[PDB]
């Protein structure tokens, strides 16, 4: 899997409170986090399914 899957979630400098998903390699599951709205890193998905299809097993 892509190395970006191993990066901690990134909220960014914008001040929104948008729910996104990131893959947590420590648990092996995608979890929710608050995204600020801009400059998203790649371990940031709009659905748990997208996240699992891209990072599952990382």
């Amino acid at each position: 899997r892509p190395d970006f899957c191993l990066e901690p979630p990134y909220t960014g400098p914008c001040l929104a409170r948008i729910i996104r998903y990131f893959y947590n390699a420590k648990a092996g599951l995608c979890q929710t986090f608050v995204y600020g709205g801009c400059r998203a890193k790649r371990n940031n998905f709009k659905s748990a399914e997208d996240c699992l299809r891209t990072c599952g097993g990382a």
Binding site: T11, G12, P13, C14, L15, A16, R17, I18, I19, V34, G36, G37, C38, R39
Partner: protein, 239 residues
């Protein structure tokens, strides 16, 4: 516009609870489940102005006349969004031109707790040092959002002083304010930064971005409404 039926009482991290309904143009942008993700400002009965980075869609709703998001009994107006008008010049990289207009499917019913904020003229000059106000339900501690609407008074900053910290990240459609002991924080985006113009509260900025830890000693950055108001008027006139 710009004249609350209920006068606010002044004197967001380090802000204070607002008098219920004293910022009648403040709306809460929520998803289909009622989850608040951004703020916004009513500019008339059929339009709301917010930030482009909020990514609002027609599936989201505009909640007007709200004060306590933790109160189920509180009377509010859940308004459906007919169409979203994101400024095509919004730069997803520099965050410049961070503004979006929301056209409501059904007009909001103005009242003592629901009304519009005034818009400035493109040539208006709000001097640095001017004490303005920003409001919203964003975090009060950098954590869940506060239930009740918060407010904070803060000074506008000169571009020169803002750049002393942010450097070249400050673009022409941005205006800074703060670094004075308060700070907008997650959940405040899209909300208003208002200053008085001949006694009427006028939208000078839209919460955009800033300190990644909501530090109160760092300049907050807002979309500069004077630089984007012509786009606003044009969008309304065409729709």
């Amino acid at each position: 516009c710009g004249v609350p039926a209920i006068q606010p009482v002044l004197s967001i991290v380090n802000g204070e609870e607002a008098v219920p309904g004293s910022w009648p143009w403040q709306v809460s942008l929520q998803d289909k489940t009622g989850f608040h993700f951004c703020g916004g400002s009513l500019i008339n009965e059929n339009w709301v102005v917010t930030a482009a980075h909020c990514g609002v869609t027609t599936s989201d709703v505009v909640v007007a006349g709200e004060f306590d998001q933790g109160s189920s009994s509180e009377k509010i107006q859940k308004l459906k969004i007919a169409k979203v008008f994101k400024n095509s010049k919004y730069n997803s990289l520099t965050i410049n031109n961070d503004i979006t207009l929301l056209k409501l499917s059904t007009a909001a019913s103005f009242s003592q707790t629901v009304s519009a904020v005034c818009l400035p003229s493109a040539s208006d000059d709000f001097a640095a040092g001017t004490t303005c106000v920003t409001t919203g339900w964003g975090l009060t501690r950098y954590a869940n959002t506060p239930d009740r609407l918060q407010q904070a008074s803060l000074p506008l900053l000169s571009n020169t002083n803002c750049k002393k910290y942010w450097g070249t990240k400050i673009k022409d459609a941005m205006i800074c304010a703060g670094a004075s002991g308060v700070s907008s924080c997650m959940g405040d985006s899209g909300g208003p930064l208002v200053c008085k113009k001949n006694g009427a509260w006028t939208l000078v900025g839209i919460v955009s971005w800033g300190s990644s830890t909501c530090s109160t000693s760092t300049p907050g950055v807002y979309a500069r409404v004077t630089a984007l108001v012509n786009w606003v008027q044009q969008t309304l006139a065409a729709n």
